[PDB]
Write an enzyme that holds these catalytic residues in place. Structure first.
Site, PDB file in Angstrom:
ATOM      1  N   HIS A  95       0.725  -1.239   0.057  1.00 53.06           N
ATOM      2  CA  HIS A  95      -0.007  -0.029   0.097  1.00 53.06           C
ATOM      3  C   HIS A  95       0.902   1.404  -0.072  1.00 53.06           C
ATOM      4  CE1 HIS A  95      -3.881  -1.851   1.481  1.00 53.06           C
ATOM      5  NE2 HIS A  95      -3.656  -2.286   0.217  1.00 53.06           N
TER       6      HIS A  95
ATOM      7  N   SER B 171      -0.159   0.485  -6.539  1.00 51.99           N
ATOM      8  CA  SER B 171      -0.239  -0.803  -7.334  1.00 51.99           C
ATOM      9  C   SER B 171       0.357  -0.531  -8.635  1.00 51.99           C
ATOM     10  CB  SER B 171      -1.627  -1.288  -7.353  1.00 51.99           C
ATOM     11  OG  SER B 171      -2.069  -1.223  -6.111  1.00 51.99           O
TER      12      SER B 171
ATOM     13  N   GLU C 273       1.563 -34.283  -4.806  1.00 54.90           N
ATOM     14  CA  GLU C 273       0.586 -33.495  -5.479  1.00 54.90           C
ATOM     15  C   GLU C 273       0.785 -32.970  -6.585  1.00 54.90           C
ATOM     16  OE1 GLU C 273      -2.423 -34.157  -5.057  1.00 54.90           O
ATOM     17  OE2 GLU C 273      -3.557 -32.659  -3.728  1.00 54.90           O
TER      18      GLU C 273
ATOM     19  N   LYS D  97     -15.791  -5.574  -8.190  1.00 55.87           N
ATOM     20  CA  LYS D  97     -15.067  -6.479  -9.154  1.00 55.87           C
ATOM     21  C   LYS D  97     -14.334  -7.750  -8.457  1.00 55.87           C
ATOM     22  CE  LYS D  97     -12.061  -6.567 -12.944  1.00 55.87           C
ATOM     23  NZ  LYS D  97     -10.769  -5.864 -12.556  1.00 55.87           N
ATOM     24  N   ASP D  98     -13.737  -7.522  -7.340  1.00 55.47           N
ATOM     25  CA  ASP D  98     -13.426  -8.654  -6.511  1.00 55.47           C
ATOM     26  C   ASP D  98     -14.565  -9.557  -6.034  1.00 55.47           C
ATOM     27  OD1 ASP D  98     -11.093  -6.780  -6.859  1.00 55.47           O
ATOM     28  OD2 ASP D  98     -10.408  -7.293  -4.991  1.00 55.47           O
TER      29      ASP D  98
HETATM   30  C1  HEM Z   1      -0.429 -15.839   0.489  1.00 52.63           C
HETATM   31  C2  HEM Z   1      -0.593 -15.839  -0.666  1.00 52.63           C
HETATM   32  C3  HEM Z   1      -0.683 -14.204  -1.174  1.00 52.63           C
HETATM   33  C4  HEM Z   1      -1.613 -13.336  -0.819  1.00 52.63           C
HETATM   34  C5  HEM Z   1      -2.670 -13.436   0.156  1.00 52.63           C
HETATM   35  C6  HEM Z   1      -1.479 -12.147  -1.601  1.00 52.63           C
HETATM   36  C7  HEM Z   1      -1.926 -11.054  -1.257  1.00 52.63           C
HETATM   37  C8  HEM Z   1      -1.743  -9.903  -2.242  1.00 52.63           C
HETATM   38  C9  HEM Z   1      -2.834  -9.078  -2.566  1.00 52.63           C
HETATM   39  C10 HEM Z   1      -4.191  -8.930  -2.107  1.00 52.63           C
HETATM   40  C11 HEM Z   1      -2.383  -7.996  -3.372  1.00 52.63           C
HETATM   41  C12 HEM Z   1      -3.072  -6.838  -4.023  1.00 52.63           C
HETATM   42  C13 HEM Z   1      -3.837  -7.486  -5.409  1.00 52.63           C
HETATM   43  C14 HEM Z   1      -3.015  -7.429  -6.508  1.00 52.63           C
HETATM   44  O1  HEM Z   1      -2.118  -6.681  -6.615  1.00 52.63           O
HETATM   45  O2  HEM Z   1      -3.047  -8.451  -7.346  1.00 52.63           O
HETATM   46  C15 HEM Z   1      -1.047  -8.662  -3.696  1.00 52.63           C
HETATM   47  C16 HEM Z   1       0.006  -7.870  -4.573  1.00 52.63           C
HETATM   48  C17 HEM Z   1       1.057  -8.393  -4.765  1.00 52.63           C
HETATM   49  N1  HEM Z   1       1.712  -9.711  -4.464  1.00 52.63           N
HETATM   50 FE1  HEM Z   1       0.757 -10.742  -3.204  1.00 52.63          FE
HETATM   51  N2  HEM Z   1      -0.270 -12.651  -2.205  1.00 52.63           N
HETATM   52  C18 HEM Z   1       0.427 -13.453  -2.074  1.00 52.63           C
HETATM   53  C19 HEM Z   1       1.322 -14.345  -2.595  1.00 52.63           C
HETATM   54  C20 HEM Z   1       2.374 -13.698  -3.436  1.00 52.63           C
HETATM   55  C21 HEM Z   1       3.493 -14.271  -4.028  1.00 52.63           C
HETATM   56  C22 HEM Z   1       3.866 -15.740  -4.150  1.00 52.63           C
HETATM   57  C23 HEM Z   1       4.240 -13.116  -4.888  1.00 52.63           C
HETATM   58  C24 HEM Z   1       5.242 -13.311  -5.400  1.00 52.63           C
HETATM   59  C25 HEM Z   1       6.332 -13.615  -4.928  1.00 52.63           C
HETATM   60  C26 HEM Z   1       3.427 -11.953  -4.372  1.00 52.63           C
HETATM   61  C27 HEM Z   1       3.851 -10.842  -4.786  1.00 52.63           C
HETATM   62  C28 HEM Z   1       2.767  -9.578  -5.032  1.00 52.63           C
HETATM   63  C29 HEM Z   1       3.224  -8.846  -5.864  1.00 52.63           C
HETATM   64  C30 HEM Z   1       4.520  -8.433  -6.530  1.00 52.63           C
HETATM   65  C31 HEM Z   1       2.132  -8.019  -5.771  1.00 52.63           C
HETATM   66  C32 HEM Z   1       1.835  -6.481  -6.270  1.00 52.63           C
HETATM   67  C33 HEM Z   1       1.277  -6.694  -7.590  1.00 52.63           C
HETATM   68  C34 HEM Z   1       1.032  -5.088  -8.257  1.00 52.63           C
HETATM   69  O3  HEM Z   1       0.315  -4.217  -7.588  1.00 52.63           O
HETATM   70  O4  HEM Z   1       1.217  -5.072  -9.313  1.00 52.63           O
HETATM   71  N3  HEM Z   1       2.250 -12.466  -3.541  1.00 52.63           N
HETATM   72  N4  HEM Z   1      -0.675  -9.489  -3.036  1.00 52.63           N
HETATM   73  C1  HEM Z   2      -2.789 -22.798   3.819  1.00 49.94           C
HETATM   74  C2  HEM Z   2      -4.053 -23.175   3.511  1.00 49.94           C
HETATM   75  C3  HEM Z   2      -4.345 -24.764   3.714  1.00 49.94           C
HETATM   76  C4  HEM Z   2      -3.772 -25.588   2.939  1.00 49.94           C
HETATM   77  C5  HEM Z   2      -2.948 -25.200   1.508  1.00 49.94           C
HETATM   78  C6  HEM Z   2      -4.031 -26.938   3.261  1.00 49.94           C
HETATM   79  C7  HEM Z   2      -3.904 -27.905   2.524  1.00 49.94           C
HETATM   80  C8  HEM Z   2      -4.322 -29.160   2.740  1.00 49.94           C
HETATM   81  C9  HEM Z   2      -4.552 -30.335   2.105  1.00 49.94           C
HETATM   82  C10 HEM Z   2      -4.118 -30.333   0.733  1.00 49.94           C
HETATM   83  C11 HEM Z   2      -5.044 -31.359   2.891  1.00 49.94           C
HETATM   84  C12 HEM Z   2      -5.189 -32.699   2.101  1.00 49.94           C
HETATM   85  C13 HEM Z   2      -6.861 -33.020   2.150  1.00 49.94           C
HETATM   86  C14 HEM Z   2      -7.057 -34.352   1.546  1.00 49.94           C
HETATM   87  O1  HEM Z   2      -5.951 -35.199   1.233  1.00 49.94           O
HETATM   88  O2  HEM Z   2      -8.144 -34.757   1.740  1.00 49.94           O
HETATM   89  C15 HEM Z   2      -5.234 -30.931   3.822  1.00 49.94           C
HETATM   90  C16 HEM Z   2      -5.805 -31.557   4.993  1.00 49.94           C
HETATM   91  C17 HEM Z   2      -6.055 -31.183   6.233  1.00 49.94           C
HETATM   92  N1  HEM Z   2      -6.016 -29.681   6.602  1.00 49.94           N
HETATM   93 FE1  HEM Z   2      -5.380 -28.531   5.176  1.00 49.94          FE
HETATM   94  N2  HEM Z   2      -4.740 -26.841   4.578  1.00 49.94           N
HETATM   95  C18 HEM Z   2      -4.834 -25.301   4.743  1.00 49.94           C
HETATM   96  C19 HEM Z   2      -5.270 -24.900   6.012  1.00 49.94           C
HETATM   97  C20 HEM Z   2      -5.656 -25.683   7.084  1.00 49.94           C
HETATM   98  C21 HEM Z   2      -6.127 -25.308   8.256  1.00 49.94           C
HETATM   99  C22 HEM Z   2      -5.825 -23.900   8.807  1.00 49.94           C
HETATM  100  C23 HEM Z   2      -6.319 -26.295   9.036  1.00 49.94           C
HETATM  101  C24 HEM Z   2      -6.912 -26.345  10.565  1.00 49.94           C
HETATM  102  C25 HEM Z   2      -7.417 -25.480  10.960  1.00 49.94           C
HETATM  103  C26 HEM Z   2      -6.363 -27.588   8.253  1.00 49.94           C
HETATM  104  C27 HEM Z   2      -6.382 -28.498   8.761  1.00 49.94           C
HETATM  105  C28 HEM Z   2      -6.418 -29.827   7.948  1.00 49.94           C
HETATM  106  C29 HEM Z   2      -6.830 -31.106   8.513  1.00 49.94           C
HETATM  107  C30 HEM Z   2      -7.281 -31.510   9.672  1.00 49.94           C
HETATM  108  C31 HEM Z   2      -6.576 -31.906   7.396  1.00 49.94           C
HETATM  109  C32 HEM Z   2      -6.756 -33.149   7.602  1.00 49.94           C
HETATM  110  C33 HEM Z   2      -8.184 -33.756   6.649  1.00 49.94           C
HETATM  111  C34 HEM Z   2      -8.016 -33.927   5.554  1.00 49.94           C
HETATM  112  O3  HEM Z   2      -7.243 -34.644   4.852  1.00 49.94           O
HETATM  113  O4  HEM Z   2      -8.931 -33.295   4.610  1.00 49.94           O
HETATM  114  N3  HEM Z   2      -6.012 -26.927   6.980  1.00 49.94           N
HETATM  115  N4  HEM Z   2      -4.902 -29.661   3.987  1.00 49.94           N
END
Ligand code: HEM
Ligand code: HEM
Ligand SMILES: CCCCCCCCCCCCCCCCCC(=O)OC[C@H](COP(=O)([O-])OCC(O)COP(=O)([O-])OC[C@@H](COC(=O)CCCCCCCCCCCCCCCCC)OC(=O)CCCCCCCCCCCCCCCCC)OC(=O)CCCCCCCCCCCCCCCCC
Ligand SMILES: CCCCCCCCCCCCCCCCCC(=O)OC[C@H](COP(=O)([O-])OCC(O)COP(=O)([O-])OC[C@@H](COC(=O)CCCCCCCCCCCCCCCCC)OC(=O)CCCCCCCCCCCCCCCCC)OC(=O)CCCCCCCCCCCCCCCCC
Ligand SMILES: CCCCCCCCCCCCCCCCCC(=O)OC[C@H](COP(=O)([O-])OCC[N+](C)(C)C)OC(=O)CCCCCCCCCCCCCCCCC
Ligand SMILES: CCCCCCCCCCCCCCCCCC(=O)OC[C@H](COP(=O)(O)OCCN)OC(=O)CCCCCCCCCCCCCCCCC
Ligand SMILES: CCCCCCCCCCCCCCCCCC(=O)OC[C@H](COP(=O)(O)OCCN)OC(=O)CCCCCCCCCCCCCCCCC
Ligand SMILES: CCCCCCCCCCCCCCCCCC(=O)OC[C@H](COP(=O)(O)OCCN)OC(=O)CCCCCCCCCCCCCCCCC
Ligand SMILES: CCCCCCCCCCCCCCCCCC(=O)OC[C@H](COP(=O)(O)OCCN)OC(=O)CCCCCCCCCCCCCCCCC
Ligand code: HEC
Ligand code: HEM
Lengths: 51, 98, 379, 74, 239, 65, 32, 56, 54, 54
Positions: free
Chosen positions: C201, C205, C271, C227-228
């Site tokens: 911010h 952007s 995966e 939009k979002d």
């Molecule tokens: C946990 C996952 C992520 C969340 C929740 C997140 C959240 C956000 C949000 C809400 C924005 C503003 C909306 C937008 O500009 O598209 C943003 C912008 C951005 N994010 Fe992320 N982000 C994530 C992961 C990443 C990753 C993996 C990268 C790359 C390494 C990244 C780099 C950026 C950049 C460079 C911007 C600026 C985009 C622009 O304004 O042109 N973010 N992020």
């Molecule tokens: C960052 C976001 C998250 C990702 C990417 C993620 C990813 C995953 C994936 C890929 C599985 C396997 C599902 C399956 O094979 O059936 C899983 C299972 C599980 N996740 Fe998450 N998870 C997330 C957040 C959470 C959170 C916050 C919790 C706890 C509150 C949670 C609790 C579980 C549990 C209990 C399982 C086992 C049940 C199941 O396999 O579906 N996860 N998660």
């Protein structure tokens, strides 16, 4: 980059090598002590008693 | 000649389609920002309006009509002298630094 | 006397971050994904919590707990497959977000870029550990392989893998600690996402043109909220199509077999969102080389702001750069397919070439091409 | 960063109409379809070729694989 | 090496909104009970689940009471048989997997709660496996006790031919030809792996109709709000 | 009691794909049987034949059930 | 020069009812 | 035009707008549930348990 | 809340999940609390504004 | 774990078998009491010195 090197930065390196090297020694001794690294610590007189 | 490929690339870039001059697409780093600050008022205003028109066009995903395209032979490099001077001054400061 | 929206402390932050934030008026649909990811995060935090209320992390009852969730809890299957396919959609949106960053030169926002890389690493870790909880065949064996990967680290490697395992092989302790880490990690992701938004911010952007849109900003609330919302509705359409029509489309069927540590599955692929990484590992013959290339594939995103040489921030005015970007995307797809396939004669060479091309495009082809770009434009 | 110190602009006039006075879908199909066609023409020569090459590689790899699994007469 | 890919049979529950033939489920349960239950199990499935999908409540009671299940300790601490109820999962044919492996040569008959969701191909694979037994081609000699099934990986299963012609007597009166038996048991096993199948498709139908109603409307709202900017006309009037 | 699967099979092997599949199969049986101490097997010729015949049968059969 | 500022025609985007010199903005306001 | 009467009656006040939304929620929920369930039972007539319970 | 008819298998796991999630909500609320307190500053034992001796 | 057949047993496992696990277990159990002692003293402080004006 080309902004680096040159005359001036070399004397800065010279004045900061002692402190940087001693910080490196600090880190090395800290790692040895924290992880209780046997290899280094089997040759230091007193603490060999740990093992 | 090489100008053939240069003109081909100018047409392929597409910033002329938005009615933009070349220097309007410059990335605004520090030296460039100082360069725009250095610009005279009229050139600055023209650049600002041109960029606003480009942003308006991209929001609607539309381009300017065929005839209102900045021709490659009419792309004045208004920023180039100021940017060159700013970069030269920065090089002078860096050289004095070493 | 004064508006609460811009005088109340919490409301001031909400206003300056979601209501009156000056956003560019020409950001394309590719900018919606930053919202969707966040929403996906919420959904992942949400459904997963409801999965945590009927899942018991233990070797002798993890799989039975999951099947009881999907077979005896009221609408347990909805939550379970919502969670799995929502993780898959999370990774789709993450890859598209990184692609948007690469394309439109958003990495000039270095603080946000590095925070994004950290978020990416955290999300891959979270998903890897999450895949272990069902304790299926693919779960157990993929966890075994990926944790044995760390044995390639010199000196400390075996101690590291035995520490991660909590023993001598993937077993009860590994499952329990993976569940605990899986619970904790997404909240760390949320905090890092807040830091990501805070860093973003301050610099506004990046609009697609790559030019400063300070002369065109519009209030966020009237326009980009709807939009979002539309974008999130589309993402929910896709996710619910996946959940309710082909739940296990993006999943290995063998995961529905209780983990038998005496039988290696014929295929041990991870995966779908990890194969692009996994293939890289299978490219390098050396084990340590494999792990280093694996890590470096993700880490190379950090080097991008240093490797940008063109004088234009964006890519829409750089055709030859667009061709290389789409070559890179095709290479990523090829790597995913190769990681999916077994390591045999027609695939070893293809994977090697794909990995080499991926690294070479990111490090070599794109900067030299941008140099040619600047030369062609007389600057 | 809030509105007020974004930039300096002069001599720029903007005309806008109330959303209740216009039609939300003005020439949606009449004007939209040519625009989509033009946008597709602009980029199809820069995005398609790598994916075509990927499809060729996919097919070649698959055919090489199950050709490898076939007998070798000996 | 090589592998048969099970051809995509035209199952009644194949279309996006085509439910399961619950009569076929009812017949497939009997097929499991009289043939497959001798050596396989669906421990995750209890008689209660059959109520409202393939059997009525009293019928489920009667089905459960036909079998004897272990119960807890008495007042004397012993184990005692009792007739089942709508809370006991399908009985395990072998008390422990070692007994199952020992009795059936040296192969463990997999539990079939998920055997459709755990096998690559689904109902097609199982149907082809059952109706795919054939005399081994020349040059292949299976050890006595193994049976050649092309669809089974390795082409050598430890499975006696499960269903021949007219194995059991369908209560409906449908002829118990091998193909009918295999189709019914495959549909039943699909229900076992995905009990929510019908409700999943129903919720998917409602989801489709809601998105078809909403997405145009939310898009219309987006156009409504953004139409200020889309029709925005600029002008430059420098001095 | 006749099995509809068998009838669909017999009527289905007549497709010209399964024809050349059977010719390749029979060639394999003569080649393997003639060779006394060979290792080659007719498994995958049978595999091609079964692939064609079973795709054919999958198209039919369920209608008769 | 302010007298030379004339709003461009919006008849392309204008909505059905409000398309004439007739008032059409009071009675048709409720409809739109 | 009817739409003008709708706006002047149920839409001008935000709270009356919410009341209209709330009652529409009831009636739309019931109508949509009826319609979707009927469509599904029509598509798969004779396969659901509801269509075969009568013979037991 | 019991997830049934008495505190049983369901309630134990449910309480585990809730006991895990809640402290992070507590942390968020604590951050908000520090924000609100910083908008005014702490109160000294004397109860009087101490803007001069800070 | 969180199952009623392995809850108490797992807690005893943490106390008896996990390396230095008992330290963590009792540290949690009594840090809860420390947390509540600090909480009650904090509320008392806010009450006494009229900090509730915030
Ligand atoms: C946990 C996952 C992520 C969340 C929740 C997140 C959240 C956000 C949000 C809400 C924005 C503003 C909306 C937008 O500009 O598209 C943003 C912008 C951005 N994010 Fe992320 N982000 C994530 C992961 C990443 C990753 C993996 C990268 C790359 C390494 C990244 C780099 C950026 C950049 C460079 C911007 C600026 C985009 C622009 O304004 O042109 N973010 N992020
Ligand atoms: C960052 C976001 C998250 C990702 C990417 C993620 C990813 C995953 C994936 C890929 C599985 C396997 C599902 C399956 O094979 O059936 C899983 C299972 C599980 N996740 Fe998450 N998870 C997330 C957040 C959470 C959170 C916050 C919790 C706890 C509150 C949670 C609790 C579980 C549990 C209990 C399982 C086992 C049940 C199941 O396999 O579906 N996860 N998660
Ligand atoms: C007709 C022939 C096919 C045309 C589309 C394929 C293609 O290559 O188009 C290139 C052509 C040229 O791209 P462009 O107009 O210069 O820039 C597009 C914007 O950057 C980004 O797109 P945009 O913001 O200008 O417009 C949104 C667009 C694209 O939306 C997205 O890209 C976001 C959604 C994920 C990807 C699409 C999923 C479907 O949505 C659609 O095209 C259809 C709706 C998709 C779901 C809602 C969004 O784009 C389109 O025709 C539409 C955008 C691409 C759609 C895929
Ligand atoms: C991950 C999960 C998958 C992805 C989820 C979606 C993420 C992105 C969501 C983006 C978003 O909310 O809106 C994108 C994007 C934003 O632009 P827009 O609001 O359509 O306005 C038109 C553009 O200015 C561009 O206007 P134009 O110059 O193309 O001419 C007007 C119009 C006329 O062209 C068309 O309508 C295309 C011809 C076929 C209809 O163009 C469009 O409608 C393009 C969109 C495709 C339809 O909207 C769409 O992509 C529309 C989706 C399809 C309509 C709604 C569903 C029915
Ligand atoms: C989360 C993931 C998915 C996200 C997308 C899908 C879910 C949201 C889609 C729709 C979002 C936009 C519309 C929501 C309603 C809304 O407030 O619209 C804006 C509109 C904008 O206002 P308006 O101008 O349309 O209407 C108010 C003005 N008068 C009175 C003159 C008509 O908000 C309202 O209308 C305010 C009242 C809303 C009442 C909502 C509760 C009613 C039921 C209570 C019980
Ligand atoms: C890295 C941070 C520490 C975590 C990884 C290593 C953990 C470990 O093994 O710690 C104990 C170990 C004690 O030393 P030890 O391995 O016994 O030395 C003789 C080896 N033949 O420690 C070590 O061996 C040294 C570990 C720190 C230095 C690594 C380089
Ligand atoms: C398949 C790709 C999507 C279909 C549409 C084709 C497409 O992407 O075209 C490129 C698109 C056009 O955007 P624009 O900024 O106008 O490009 C320059 C025009 N001279 O530009 C972009 O799509 C830019 C964003 C690309 C990166 C995000 C999407 C791909 C992510 C892959 C991982
Ligand atoms: C935010 C709220 C959602 C906004 C819109 C996005 C979600 C898609 C909505 C449109 C498709 C689904 C519409 C729908 O309701 O379909 C009907 C279906 C239930 O159908 P059925 O089982 O026949 O029951 C009918 C009688 N009640 O019900 C469904 O299909 C429900 C949709 C699938 C489930 C996921 C919904 C989104 C994620 C959860 C949001 C709410 C979180 C609540 C957290 C806990 C609160 C205590
Ligand atoms: C502690 C026991 C000693 C004690 O409290 O001594 C009294 C002393 C007086 O403090 P002072 O700020 O000088 O009071 C004005 C004097 N003219 O100190 C105080 O008055 C300080 C103690 C009262 C204020 C702090 C809160 C203490 C709460 C203790 C009980 C917590 C549980 C009950 C309340 C919830
Ligand atoms: C008297 C014994 C017996 C009967 C009757 C029997 N099976 Fe089996 N089944 C086995 C054994 C033993 C295996 C293990 C084969 C192997 O793993 O090599 C097996 C394997 C299977 C497999 C494993 C396929 C795979 O590769 O994953 C399926 C599916 C199966 N049976 C289903 C059935 C069905 C359906 C029926 C009857 C309607 C049935 N069985 C009847 C003993 C039996
Ligand atoms: C989660 C537990 C809590 C944390 C972490 C927390 C945190 C803090 C901290 C660090 C301070 C500043 C130091 C101080 O003045 O004591 C503070 C101040 C304060 N807290 Fe809390 N607090 C908690 C619970 C409470 C409770 C239960 C109340 C009473 C309802 C409360 C009311 C206050 C007040 C009134 C102040 C200002 C004190 C003053 O200005 O003199 N807090 N809080």
């Amino acid at each position: 980059l080309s902004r680096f090197l040159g005359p001036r930065y070399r004397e800065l390196a010279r004045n900061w090598i002692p402190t940087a090297s001693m910080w490196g020694a600090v880190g090395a001794v800290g790692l040895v002590w924290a992880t209780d690294w046997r290899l280094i610590l089997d040759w230091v007189p007193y603490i060999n008693g740990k093992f | 000649w090489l100008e053939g490929i240069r003109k081909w690339y100018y047409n392929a870039a597409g910033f002329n389609k938005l009615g933009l001059m070349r220097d309007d697409t410059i990335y605004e780093d520090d030296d460039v920002k100082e360069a725009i600050r250095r610009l005279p008022e009229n050139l600055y205003n023209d650049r600002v309006f041109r960029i606003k028109r480009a942003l308006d066009l991209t929001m609607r995903q539309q381009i300017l009509p065929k005839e209102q395209w900045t021709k490659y032979e009419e792309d004045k490099f208004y920023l180039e002298p100021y940017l060159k001077e700013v970069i030269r001054e920065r090089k002078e400061r860096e050289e004095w630094a070493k | 006397m004064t508006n609460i929206r811009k005088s109340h402390p919490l409301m001031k932050i909400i206003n300056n971050a979601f209501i009156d934030l000056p956003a560019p008026s020409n950001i394309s649909s590719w900018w919606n994904f930053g919202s969707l990811l966040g929403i996906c995060l919420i959904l992942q935090i949400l459904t997963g919590l409801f999965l945590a209320m009927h899942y018991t992390s233990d070797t002798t009852t993890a799989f039975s707990s999951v099947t009881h969730i999907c077979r005896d809890v009221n609408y347990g299957w909805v939550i379970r497959y919502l969670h799995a396919n929502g993780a898959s959609m999370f990774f789709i949106c993450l890859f598209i977000h990184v692609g948007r960053g690469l394309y439109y030169g958003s990495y000039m926002f270095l603080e946000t870029w590095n925070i994004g890389v950290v978020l990416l690493f955290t999300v891959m870790a979270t998903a890897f550990m999450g895949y272990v909880l069902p304790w299926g065949q693919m779960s157990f064996w993929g966890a075994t392989v990926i944790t044995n990967l760390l044995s390639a680290i010199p000196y400390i490697g075996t101690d590291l893998v035995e520490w991660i395992w909590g023993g001598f092989s993937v077993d009860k302790a590994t499952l329990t600690r993976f569940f605990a880490f899986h619970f904790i990690l997404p909240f760390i992701i949320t905090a890092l996402a807040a830091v990501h938004l805070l860093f973003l911010h301050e610099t506004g952007s990046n609009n697609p043109t790559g030019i400063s849109s300070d002369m065109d900003k519009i209030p966020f609330h009237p326009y980009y909220t709807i939009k979002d919302i539309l974008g999130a509705l589309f993402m929910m359409l896709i996710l619910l199509i996946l959940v309710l029509f082909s739940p296990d489309l993006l999943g290995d069927p063998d995961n529905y077999t209780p983990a038998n540590p005496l039988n290696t599955p014929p295929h041990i692929k991870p995966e779908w969102y990890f194969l692009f990484a996994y293939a890289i590992l299978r490219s390098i013959p050396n084990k340590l080389g494999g792990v280093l290339a694996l890590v470096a594939s993700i880490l190379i995103l950090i080097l991008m702001p240093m490797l940008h040489t063109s004088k234009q921030r964006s890519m829409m005015f750089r055709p030859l750069s667009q061709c290389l970007f789409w070559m890179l995307v095709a290479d990523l797809i090829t790597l995913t397919w190769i990681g999916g396939q077994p390591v045999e004669h027609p695939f070893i060479i293809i994977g090697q070439l794909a990995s080499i091309l991926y690294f070479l495009i990111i490090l070599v082809l794109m900067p030299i091409t941008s140099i040619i770009e600047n030369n062609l434009l007389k600057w | 960063r809030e509105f007020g110190h974004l930039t300096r602009m002069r001599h720029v006039i903007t005309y806008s109409l109330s959303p209740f006075e216009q039609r939300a879908f003005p020439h949606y199909f009449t004007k939209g379809i040519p625009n989509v066609l033009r946008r597709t023409r602009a980029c199809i020569l820069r995005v398609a070729p790598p994916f075509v090459v990927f499809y060729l590689v996919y097919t070649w790899g698959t055919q090489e694989f199950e050709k490898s699994k076939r007998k070798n007469p000996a | 090496d090589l592998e048969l890919h099970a051809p995509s049979y035209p199952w009644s529950h194949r279309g996006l909104l085509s439910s399961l033939d619950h009569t076929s489920i009812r017949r497939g349960f009997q097929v499991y009970k009289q043939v497959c239950s001798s050596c396989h199990s669906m421990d995750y499935v209890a008689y209660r689940h059959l109520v409202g999908v393939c059997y009525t409540e009293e019928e489920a009671k009667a089905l459960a009471e036909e079998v004897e299940v272990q119960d807890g300790p008495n007042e004397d601490g012993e184990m005692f048989m009792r007739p089942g109820k709508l809370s006991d999962y399908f009985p395990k044919p072998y008390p422990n997997p070692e007994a199952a492996r020992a009795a059936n040569n040296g192969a463990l008959p997999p539990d079939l709660s998920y055997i459709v969701r755990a096998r690559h191909g689904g109902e097609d694979y199982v149907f082809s496996l059952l109706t795919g037994y054939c005399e081994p081609p020349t040059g292949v000699s299976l050890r006595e006790g193994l049976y050649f099934n092309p669809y089974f990986p390795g082409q050598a299963i430890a499975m006696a031919p499960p269903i021949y012609n007219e194995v059991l007597e369908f209560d409906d009166g449908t002829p118990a030809t091998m193909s009918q038996v295999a189709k019914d048991v495959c549909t039943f096993l699909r229900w076992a792996s995905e009990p929510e199948h019908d409700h999943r498709k129903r919720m998917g139908l409602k989801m489709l109709m809601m998105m078809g109603l909403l997405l145009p409307l939310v898009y219309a709202m987006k156009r409504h709000k953004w139409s200020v900017l889309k029709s925005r006309k600029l002008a430059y009037r420098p001095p | 009691l006749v099995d509809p699967l068998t009838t669909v099979r017999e009527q289905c092997e007549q497709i010209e794909k399964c024809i050349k599949a059977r010719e390749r199969l029979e060639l394999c049986d003569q080649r393997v049987s003639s060779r006394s101490q060979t290792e080659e097997d007719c498994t995958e010729e049978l595999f091609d034949f079964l692939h064609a015949r079973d795709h054919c049968v999958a198209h039919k059969l369920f209608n008769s059930l | 020069s302010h007298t030379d500022i004339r709003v461009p025609d919006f008849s392309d985007y204008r909505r059905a009812e409000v398309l004439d010199s007739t008032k059409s903005s009071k009675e048709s306001s409720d409809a739109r | 035009t009817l739409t003008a009467r709708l706006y002047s009656l149920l839409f001008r006040r935000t709270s009356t707008f919410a009341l209209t939304i709330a009652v529409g929620a009831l009636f739309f929920e019931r109508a949509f549930d009826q319609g979707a369930d009927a469509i599904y039972e029509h598509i798969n007539q004779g396969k659901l348990w509801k269509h075969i319970k009568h013979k037991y």
